Scaffold this active site. Structure first.
Site, short mmCIF file in Angstrom:
data_model
loop_
_atom_site.label_atom_id
_atom_site.label_comp_id
_atom_site.label_asym_id
_atom_site.label_seq_id
_atom_site.Cartn_x
_atom_site.Cartn_y
_atom_site.Cartn_z
CG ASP B 136 -2.10 1.01 1.00
OD1 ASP B 136 -2.49 1.28 -0.16
OD2 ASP B 136 -2.61 1.52 2.02
CG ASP B 154 -0.30 2.99 7.39
OD1 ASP B 154 -0.01 3.05 8.60
OD2 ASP B 154 -1.31 3.54 6.90
#
Ligand SMILES: Nc1ncnc2c1ncn2[C@@H]1O[C@H](COP(=O)(O)OP(=O)(O)NP(=O)(O)O)[C@@H](O)[C@H]1O
Ligand SMILES: Nc1ncnc2c1ncn2[C@@H]1O[C@H](COP(=O)(O)OP(=O)(O)NP(=O)(O)O)[C@@H](O)[C@H]1O
Ligand SMILES: [Mg+2]
Ligand SMILES: [Mg+2]
Lengths: 297, 297
Positions: B136, B154
């Site tokens: 991502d 993340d």
């Protein structure tokens, strides 16, 4: 020159008073980078008593030049009719108020590691041929409980009798050797958990009682060997006082077996933080370089 | 010892910072037991993984996130397995790079853009050495520590948990076949650079994601950013090639963007570019002292 940043008045704002002292008022502040929308917390010290700006700037460059993990660097300045000094914000506050608030839970390894760190800072300043002249627990800042830094040197250049060497009181003489005297008083403040030195004696009579041989008494937790050092710090003959390099060695040796030079009840309950807690502290509050705390053998 | 287990009662969430495909990010305050200080933290509370995963396995995957050490990757600092999964990281007051480039749409110089591309590829190269696939990467998942220092966040969440599929950032083989690799991350890198060079434009704006696979297989890609020389755009195009193994590798991306940063105005065409230089020596000295204690023309 590149280490001192000249701030403009619109770049920063005072939001809370953190306390005040002989030379000024310390505020919590917020630094607004120009064109940005973030609010960066700082500590601002506003001097008292509004062509002296050349003088002030040239000492501010020296203050901004100190690069040692146990001395606070001056980060920036704003020159209005009141000089404003910008430094990093230490939300734990000063070590004096720290030891008073934790008087029942400070273990031996902390106290001994703090005097090592304070010595390292003063040794660095002595290697720079810089005299502090206002060393005291109130002027040691807690960045994390495991990391303390000396603050406010050079501010005296541009009266704390009970921390002063005798020759400073009688003749306004300040050397690295009289800084060692104030270091002794600072150690005494920490070992007593923030007692006031010579409580009950007027400052105007301190030089009388010093000349007659009287000194701050032995803290209840200090063994003989620790009290000796403090007393060696208050020798009339400054050249007979220990040097800061010697104190680093002495206090690092005691920090390797802390429970043999400090006797305090519950001392088992109060060791230094885990590796885990130290990594966590450092990642959130203290990512600068540092020599490791000395641990028990 | 890199992952602190936090108790519900020693940190409290304050203001919601935003929400995405993996959970909600709060600004919180860490309060160490026995202390009187409030330390700002960022808290990411995770959505329920529809993979019903054992607590200890979550711990094992969190340890990997806690064990990354590189200036351009964000470390997982603490975790609480509460009644939900709460992740404790350092609070970045500047927020993500995507919002940063949108808010400064026309005061972002070539030196900043190219240096950011370099840093992102460094952190992705580090992740690739540790055999960690991001899944991502996007400009929303690059955090601004200072304007001059950004970090990838993340990573591994898509791994951990299983709308919320950033189809417009995925390589063809991920959309078609659920194939996530380091070469797949290079595609998302290319899209991330495009976001940067457009000052935060939405990619394939107006095209629904169900059509994305169709238009990629037809050979059309994102268009050349108005500021990008073909030199820069040829790099982006190489990231979006069909064969994953013909795409560039991060260490070559590091090399080429570092070469371009040494002559930034020959690779990006920005009006008023000489007025938007990297900070003066003083300005970064100050930025680093206050916020960031951890290639010029
Ligand atoms: N950088 C800082 N961050 C947070 N608190 C600070 C900082 N510098 C000073 N303080 C606090 O601000 C208060 C006022 O400090 P100051 O004006 O230096 O007086 P003082 O140090 O206590 N006495 P003196 O230094 O001898 O003039 C004290 O409680 C300090 O602990
Ligand atoms: N540690 C942090 N400090 C400050 N802001 C943060 C931090 N982590 C995340 N944010 C911000 O909070 C927003 C919401 O978090 P997040 O759930 O990751 O949304 P997202 O990144 O936009 N979507 P996703 O692709 O699923 O990660 C992000 O877009 C960031 O701008
Ligand atoms: Mg002070
Ligand atoms: Mg995110």
């Amino acid at each position: 020159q590149a280490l001192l940043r000249i701030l403009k008045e619109t770049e920063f704002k005072k939001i809370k008073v953190l306390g005040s002292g002989a030379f000024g008022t310390v505020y919590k502040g917020l630094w607004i980078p120009e064109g940005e929308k973030v609010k960066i917390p700082v500590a601002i010290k506003e001097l008292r008593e509004a062509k002296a700006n050349k003088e002030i700037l040239d000492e501010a460059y020296v203050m901004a030049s100190v690069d040692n993990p146990h001395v606070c660097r001056l980060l920036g300045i704003c020159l209005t009719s009141t000089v404003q000094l910008i430094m990093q914000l230490m939300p734990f506050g000063c070590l004096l108020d720290y030891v008073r608030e934790h008087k029942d839970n400070i273990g031996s390894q902390y106290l001994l590691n703090w005097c090592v760190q304070i010595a390292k800072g003063m040794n660095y300043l002595e290697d720079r041929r810089l005299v502090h002249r206002d060393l005291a627990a109130r002027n040691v800042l807690v960045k994390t409980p495991q990391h303390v830094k000396i603050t406010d040197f050079g501010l005296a250049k541009l009266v704390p009798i009970k921390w002063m060497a005798l020759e400073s009181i009688l003749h306004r003489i300040y050397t690295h050797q009289s800084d060692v005297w104030s270091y002794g008083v600072t150690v005494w403040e920490l070992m007593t958990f923030g007692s006031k030195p010579y409580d009950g004696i007027p400052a105007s009579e301190i030089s009388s009682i010093l000349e007659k041989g009287e000194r701050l008494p032995q803290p209840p937790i200090c063994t003989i060997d620790v009290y000796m050092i403090m007393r060696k710090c208050w020798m009339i003959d400054a050249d007979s006082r220990p040097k800061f390099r010697e104190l680093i060695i002495e206090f690092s040796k005691m920090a390797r077996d802390p429970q043999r030079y400090l006797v305090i009840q519950g001392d088992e309950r109060m060791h230094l933080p885990s590796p885990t807690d130290s990594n966590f502290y450092r990642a959130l509050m203290d990512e600068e370089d540092m020599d490791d705390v000395v641990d028990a053998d």
